[PDB]
Ligand binder design. Structure first.
Ligand SMILES: [Cu+2]
Ligand SMILES: [Cu+2]
Ligand SMILES: [K+]
Ligand SMILES: [K+]
Ligand code: NA
Ligand code: NA
Lengths: 620, 620
C-alpha cells in the first residue's frame, strides 16, 4: 500500500523487462544507476504509480540514456540520449574499476616505471579513482579513471602501507586504453607493514575487557510495518534506501496528542566530497564524490550482530540493481534499534520536596559503506524530546603517499617514509522541510551584543536577531560560530498556543568548509561545499547539490544553477542544504587503521510544541 | 597511603578538633569552605602531610579567617585574617540563604508590596541570590543577598511557575537587616501551574517504552583501589572530590607498553558562571557563580541506581564538612562505570580480503548537583583511543519572570504571561597539564588556505600553521571556528618515534563566550568567560579563574591577575583554562521542566603514541 515502501526484487526485475521490451536494454547496455522515485506532490490523492529512474551506459561507446519507467503501468515515461561532455558522465561502474590494474599490467610505460622501482607487477595493486576535470582535452566525452599504485607483499598484506609515489596513470575504461603514464621520479616505497591483525604489530591482545550485555527482554519499543514504516515514541517515518544516497528518511512526523505533525518530508545525504590538498601532480586531481560518482549505497556493508550493531537489532535488507538490471540484496545492510541516552530531565526541588528524574533514549537508523580504503558510517537519530540528529563516522585506512625528505606543508608523517596527504570529508544534507506542512520559511538567528548605556546601564543585556531569507538570491549563508548563528525553519501559518510560528532550529558544528582556491576545478564542481547553508524552492528535478551527473562534469549544474532562479522561499515548499565536514590532517594515531572520528548536525524544536513534549514519560 | 585519597569522616572531625582547641571555632564561627590540599610539587619524596584549607566566617561580624591545618600532626599551620572589602567575601552559607525569606516576611515594605499584589506572605518563596558588586557603596565589606519572589500555591507546587516581577529586596545576612526593597510596579503573576507530576498536565503516562537492560555478567573492566584510584583499559587516575569544584580528576596517565605516561596532572571545572541578560533592574544584577559563590560539590545529589546511573555502577560517597565542622557523607554522590561507545575502528579490505571491526567503550565518572532551580550534571569520559572528554548537562526548571506586554528583546515567553530571561551558562575547565611530564608548551593551530599559482597550479592545496604561546601576555586566545582553530599541548623534550614532540589537541565547541559589555561588573568579575583559552604558568595559589573569594569581589581577580605576571610558558609547568558554555534563549519546550542540553570539549592524542593505541583490542 505505502508508496514509500522499499523497492522489491520483483519491481527491479520488472523494470529490467520494461526496458528490454522498449529496446533500451540490449546486451551492450549496463545499468549505472537505478532507483525508485518519490511520489509526486499531491499524488497521495491518487492511486499508486511506482516510477523508477535509470541511467543506462553503453559499453560500445554509444551515447548513454536517462530513462524513467512506470513499473506500475509497464511504460517508459521518458528516455533521453545524453551528451556526456556537456552534462556529465554516468557514475562509475563497479566493473570499470578492475579494468585499470589489468590494462596497466601490460603497458610498457607502466612496466618501465615499476622496473625503475624494482617492483614486481604481480604485486602492484592500483587504486582506480575518479578523474575529475582538468586540462586534458582528450578526456572530454570519455570515461577515464586515474590509477595510483600500492605494493601488496602477500595476499593478506595491507597494500596501503606501501604507496608508490611519483607515479600515476590515466585509463579510458570504455576503449580500454592507457592514455597517459606520468612518472615524476622514484620515491622509496615505505617498507613497514600496516597489518593490524598481525600479532607482531598488535602485541598480545587485551584480556581486560569484560562483557557489556545490552538486551531488551520484552523486545524493542518501535514497530515496523509495511516493511519500512517505523513508529517509535510518538515518531513516525519511512526508511528508504537508494543506491546513490544510501539510507533516506521520508515523512518524519511527530504525534502530538491527536495530530500527526509533519517535520521533515525527506532527509538524506545528497552528496559527499573528499578533496585532497597535496599539490603534487601525482594527487592534485584527487577528489572523491562518494555519493555522486561512486554511489555509496551500492557499497553498503552487511552488518554483523554483536560487532557492528549491538543490542536488540531489527535489520532491513535493501534491494538494488546489478549492472544488468537483476536484483541483488544487501543482506542486513541497515540497522535499526533504540539506545538508552542517559538523563532526559531532572530536578530536585527544595520548596516542593519533589525529586524528579527521567531517562532519555534515541531511535537509531544506520548503515556503513566501504569506498576503497575508507569506510563511512551514516547514523540518523530521533530523540524523545523531538531532536533530530545526523552523525557521520569516518574510519578505514588513511590514503597514503611517500613522506618527502625534508618534510611537507601538505602531508603528515605516519611511519618511517610514509605520508598521509591532507584532505577533507564534506557532506551535504538535503532536508526537504515540512514543518507542520509545506508552508515554511528560514530565518538566520544571531546573538546580538548590546552596549552599556541608557536602557542597559549595567551593561549586562544581550539579545538576538532573526533575518528571514525571502528569496533564493538571499539564501546562501555562512557559519558564524562567534555570534552563535543558527537557522530556524518555521511555518508562518501554524502558530503554537503563545501565538508564535512553530519552528525547528538547526545547530551546525561550524567546521571549516571547502578549503580549495575558489578558482579551482574542485571549488566549481563542489560549489555546495563552499558555504554552510543553502535554501531552495522545492523542485522535482533538483535532487543533488552537484546535479544528476557528477563524474567528469565541470561546473554548470547543481545548487549554483538552482539558486539563480531567485524563487520565493518565504512561506513556501522549501529545501535546506547543509554543508558540514571534517578537515583531516592525519595523526600517527590514525595508522595503521583509523579510530572513528565524527561530524554531524542536529535540529531541535523551537516553539514547535506548546510545552515540553516529554512530560508523559514514566519513571524508570 | 596515596596522598590523593578522598578525605575520611575522621579527617574532617580531626580538623574540627584542631580548630576548636586552637580557639578558632567558637559559637559564632562557621565553616564556609573546607577541603584537603593537594600535595605540592615534588613532595612524593618527603613523607606526607595531609593538610586542609578552611574559610571561617563569623556571624557576629568579626573578621573571617583563612586557616590551614595539618591533620597528620594536629597543628594549625597558618591562620590569616581577611579584609573582605579588599579580597572578597566568603562563600554563602546554607544558613544565610534561609535568613532572607524569614526577614522579608516581617518587613513593612515587603509586606506592602505583597499586599498590593494580593499575595499571602505565607505562600511567597524567596530565591536568595548572590549580590555581586554594583553601585551600592554601603554594601562594601558587608554580606548581602538579593531576593526574588515566587508564589507557591500549596506545599507540592512548583513556585517557579509564579514569579512576582517588579519586586526585589536586598538583605544584610549578618546584621539581619533589609537594606532595600525595590518595587518598580505590579506585573501579573503568571497563573498556570508548572507541576510536571500532575496528571492533568502530563496526561496519561506512556506505556510504550520497553525495558533496555544493561548488565555486566562478569562485572566491570575497571578496578578501584585505595578508595579512589581507578585503572581501566590502560588509563590510570585518582578521583577526588572537593566541596567547591565537585569531582576532580588527578594524575590522568596512560600505560603505553611498560611506561606509565602522564597526560593531565589535575582536571576540574574551576568555575561556572550564569550571567543574566535582562536589563530590568529587578534582575540586572543577577549572576550565579555556582562554583565560586555557591560551591557545587556541597549540593551534589545522591544518585539512584536504575534511575540516574544505569548498568553496572560503582559509587563513591565523598565526605564534606557542614558549617560546624562535622563530617557529612554524600551517599552515592559519584557514579563510575564503563559504557559501550559504538564502533571503534572498521575496514573491509578488497585486496587483503580481511574484514575488521572493533567496538569502542568509555569510562564515565560523573556527579549531579542542584543550585536552586537548576540542576547540572558533570561528566568526564576516558576513551579506549586516548581521547579525554568533558560534558556538562543542563536541566532543572528555568528561572522565570513576567513576560512584558508588547514583548521583550531580552526575555522569551514560555507560557501565558510567563517569561524566561536570556542568560548563559559558562564553564572554566582548569587543566594542569602534564604531557609526558611537566615540561609542556601550547601551540595555536589554524588551517591555512593557499592561493592558486606556482607550486599550487590546480589550487587544491591547503595547509596549517602553529604558533607557540611563549609568555602569558600572549596566552589569552579566542576561538576561530572558520579556520578550524585548535590548541596543542606538547612536550618539547619527549618525542615520538618519528622525532616529533608528543602532544594532545584540544577541540572546542566554539560556542559564544561572555556577551556582556566589556565595561560591566560581570565582565570584570568573570573575565575568564570573555575568552576561550588561557595558559598560565603553574602556581600553588592559582586555583580558580575568578580568585579565592568570588562573593562580592569588585573584579579583576583570578586569570586577569595571574596573566599580568607575564611568565614564561614555553617548555614549563603550565595550566590550560578552557572557557565553554551555553547561550540560552529559553524555548517553550524548556517548560515546565527542561530537557537536558549539553556542552563540553575534548582532547585527542596528536602524535602522543607511535601508532594507534587500540591495535590490541580483541574482536567482540
Ligand atoms: Cu580523513
Ligand atoms: Cu539556561
Ligand atoms: K506493471
Ligand atoms: K593526627
Ligand atoms: Na519542503
Ligand atoms: Na602543568
Amino acid at each position: 500500500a505505502s508508496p514509500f515502501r522499499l523497492a522489491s526484487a520483483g519491481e527491479i526485475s520488472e523494470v529490467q523487462g520494461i526496458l528490454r521490451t522498449a529496446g533500451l536494454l540490449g546486451p551492450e547496455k549496463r545499468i549505472a544507476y537505478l532507483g525508485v522515485l518519490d511520489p509526486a506532490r499531491g499524488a497521495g490523492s491518487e492511486a499508486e504509480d511506482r516510477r523508477f529512474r535509470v541511467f543506462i551506459h553503453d559499453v560500445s561507446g554509444a551515447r548513454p540514456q536517462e530513462v524513467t519507467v512506470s513499473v506500475t503501468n509497464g511504460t517508459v515515461i521518458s528516455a533521453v540520449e545524453l551528451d556526456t561532455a556537456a552534462t556529465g558522465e554516468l557514475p562509475v561502474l563497479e566493473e570499470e574499476f578492475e579494468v585499470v590494474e589489468q590494462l596497466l599490467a601490460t603497458d610498457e610505460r607502466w612496466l618501465k616505471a615499476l622496473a625503475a622501482r624494482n617492483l614486481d607487477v604481480s604485486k602492484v595493486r592500483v587504486a582506480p579513482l575518479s578523474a575529475g576535470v582538468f586540462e586534458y582535452a582528450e578526456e572530454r566525452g570519455r570515461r577515464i579513471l586515474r590509477g595510483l599504485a600500492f605494493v601488496q607483499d602477500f595476499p593478506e598484506d595491507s597494500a596501503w602501507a606501501h604507496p608508490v609515489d611519483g607515479l600515476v596513470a590515466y585509463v579510458d575504461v570504455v576503449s580500454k586504453e592507457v592514455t597517459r603514464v606520468i612518472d615524476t621520479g622514484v620515491f622509496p616505497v615505505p617498507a613497514e607493514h600496516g597489518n593490524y591483525t598481525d600479532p607482531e604489530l598488535t602485541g598480545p591482545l587485551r584480556t581486560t575487557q569484560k562483557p557489556i550485555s545490552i538486551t531488551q527482554p520484552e523486545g524493542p519499543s518501535f514497530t515496523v510495518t509495511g516493511g519500512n514504516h517505523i513508529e517509535w515514541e510518538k515518531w513516525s517515518l519511512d526508511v528508504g534506501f537508494d543506491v546513490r544516497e544510501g539510507v533516506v528518511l521520508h515523512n518524519i512526523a511527530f504525534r502530538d496528542g491527536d495530530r500527526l505533525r509533519p517535520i521533515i518530508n525527506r532527509a538524506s545525504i545528497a552528496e559527499m566530497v573528499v578533496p585532497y590538498g597535496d599539490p603534487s601532480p601525482i594527487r592534485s586531481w584527487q577528489n572523491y564524490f562518494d555519493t555522486g560518482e561512486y554511489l555509496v549505497g551500492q557499497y553498503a556493508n552487511s552488518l554483523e550482530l554483536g560487532c557492528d550493531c549491538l543490542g536488540d537489532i531489527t535489520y532491513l535488507s535493501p534491494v538494488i540493481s546489478d549492472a544488468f538490471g537483476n536484483p541483488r540484496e544487501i543482506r542486513n545492510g541497515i540497522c535499526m534499534h533504540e539506545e538508552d541516552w542517559g538523563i532526559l530531565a531532572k530536578h530536585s526541588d527544595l520548596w516542593s520536596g519533589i525529586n524528579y528524574t527521567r531517562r532519555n533514549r534515541r531511535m537509531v537508523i544506520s548503515f556503513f559503506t566501504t569506498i576503497g580504503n575508507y569506510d563511512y558510517g551514516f547514523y540518523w537519530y530521533l530523540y524523545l524530546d523531538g531532536t533530530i540528529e545526523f552523525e557521520a563516522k569516518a574510519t578505514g585506512v588513511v590514503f597514503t603517499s611517500a613522506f618527502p625528505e625534508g618534510g611537507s606543508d601538505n602531508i603528515s608523517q605516519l611511519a618511517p617514509g610514509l605520508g598521509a596527504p591532507f584532505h577533507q570529508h564534506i557532506f551535504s544534507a538535503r532536508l526537504d522541510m515540512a514543518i507542520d506542512g509545506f508552508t515554511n520559511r528560514v530565518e538566520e538567528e544571531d546573538v546580538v551584543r548590546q552596549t552599556m548605556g541608557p536602557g542597559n546601564e549595567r551593561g549586562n543585556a544581550f539579545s538576538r536577531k532573526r533575518t528571514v531569507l525571502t528569496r533564493e538570491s538571499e539564501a546562501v549563508r555562512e557559519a558564524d560560530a562567534r555570534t552563535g548563528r543558527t537557522w530556524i525553519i518555521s511555518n508562518p501559518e501554524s502558530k503554537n498556543r503563545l501565538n508564535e510560528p512553530v519552528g525547528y532550529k538547526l545547530h551546525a558544528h561550524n567546521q571549516p568548509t571547502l578549503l580549495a582556491d575558489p578558482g579551482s576545478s574542485i571549488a566549481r564542481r563542489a560549489a555546495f561545499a563552499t558555504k554552510d547553508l543553502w535554501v531552495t524552492r522545492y523542485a522535482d528535478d533538483e535532487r543533488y547539490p552537484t546535479g544528476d551527473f557528477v563524474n567528469q562534469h565541470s561546473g554548470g549544474a547543481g545548487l549554483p544553477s538552482y539558486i539563480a532562479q531567485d524563487r520565493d522561499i518565504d512561506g513556501q515548499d522549501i529545501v535546506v542544504w547543509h554543508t558540514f565536514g571534517l578537515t583531516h590532517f592525519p595523526r600517527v594515531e590514525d595508522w595503521p587503521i583509523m579510530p572513528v572520528d565524527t561530524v554531524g548536525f542536529k535540529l531541535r524544536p523551537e516553539g514547535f510544541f506548546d510545552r515540553s513534549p516529554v512530560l508523559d514519560v514514566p519513571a524508570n
